[PDB]
Design a protein around this ligand. Structure first.
Ligand code: 8ZN
Length: 291
């Protein structure tokens, strides 16, 4: 892992914060070249052994990856305190908030392109034998080219740190509305449970960041899923896209597409973009009648 001297890092603005460090936007000097914008996460003094292992472990995992749709690591400060992880800077931030702040501003083809990128990053991770466990729009980052990159890596720290992941009756901490039934029921997290999550992300993207299952409680979500109910079609959603998200939500893990199948289908739809003009029917909640 590239070790960066602290004199090369200028933290400029807090963009996220937690009890044991912050995330900053800043600049990285890498004498001749212009400084480059970066994101910087810190780990403050007094950290425990487990915190150090988890913090640097995220950097270690990220350093094993080289893919357009996976956040790129610039390096770490580990020889000086506070320790830091430095990555590329994603100008548009988290995908969930981005979509909610840009409601209706993109074309269907742009939205599907975002899903293609996410799927390519997930195919890469699954092929690398990395199970994400927390795939959700809140853990995707977006740059000024609209490229979506998978974020949030690690072992126990991922679900521990995400406030959407809640303690269950069985004792595990999981983000219920994004998690496959086998992962909820018996702690079985695999690339196929990540495919379930990806289907939820597809729904998030096509609804501009609606909250999955709206106000249903976590218990009610699990009950509906076990009863066979599934999220309904977003408004303005290509039929092929809704069909694909439905396949991701098969109860039987073995029936779900693999990420390779998802990427292939999304590629083909984008290459023949008229295919996206055929929309799934939308079930209205409200009737407007006028004579
Ligand atoms: C530094 C680091 C360590 C370990 C793992 C990772 Cl993935 C990282 N890298 C990062 O966290 C980030 C890389 N790019 C980021 N861009 C970003 C940018 C912003 C943000 O300041 N700007 C945009 C400008 C204001 N409009 C909305 C978003 C906000 C966030 C969020 F709130 F989410 F934190 C993120 S965060």
């Amino acid at each position: 892992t590239t070790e960066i001297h602290p004199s090369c890092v200028t933290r400029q603005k807090v963009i996220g914060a937690g009890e044991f460090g912050e995330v900053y936007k800043g600049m990285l000097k890498t004498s001749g070249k212009k400084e480059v914008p970066v994101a910087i996460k810190t780990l403050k003094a007094g950290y425990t052994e487990k915190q150090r292992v988890d913090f640097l472990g995220e950097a270690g995992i990220m350093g094993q990856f080289s893919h357009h749709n996976i956040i790129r690591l610039e390096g770490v400060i580990s020889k000086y305190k506070p320790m830091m992880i430095i990555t590329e800077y994603m100008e548009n931030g988290a995908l969930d908030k981005f979509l909610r702040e840009k409601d209706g501003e993109f074309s269907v083809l742009q939205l599907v392109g975002m899903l293609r990128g996410i799927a390519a990053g997930m195919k890469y991770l699954a092929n690398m034998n990395y199970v994400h466990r927390d795939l959700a729009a809140r853990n995707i980052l977006v740059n000024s080219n609209l490229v979506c990159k998978v974020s949030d890596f690690g072992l126990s720290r991922v679900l521990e740190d995400d406030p959407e992941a809640t303690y269950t009756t069985s004792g595990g901490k999981i983000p219920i509305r994004w998690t496959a039934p086998e992962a909820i029921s018996y702690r079985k997290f695999t690339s196929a449970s990540d495919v379930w999550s990806f289907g939820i992300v597809m729904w998030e993207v096509m609804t501009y960041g609606e909250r999955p299952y709206w106000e249903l409680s976590n218990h009610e979500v699990m009950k509906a899923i076990n009863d066979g109910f599934r999220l309904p079609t977003p408004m303005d959603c290509p039929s092929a896209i809704y069909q694909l998200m439905m396949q991701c939500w098969q109860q039987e893990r073995a029936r779900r597409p693999k990420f390779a199948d998802i990427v292939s289908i999304l590629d083909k739809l984008i290459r023949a973009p008229d295919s996206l003009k055929t929309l799934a029917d939308f079930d209205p909640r409200v009737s407007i009648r006028l004579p």
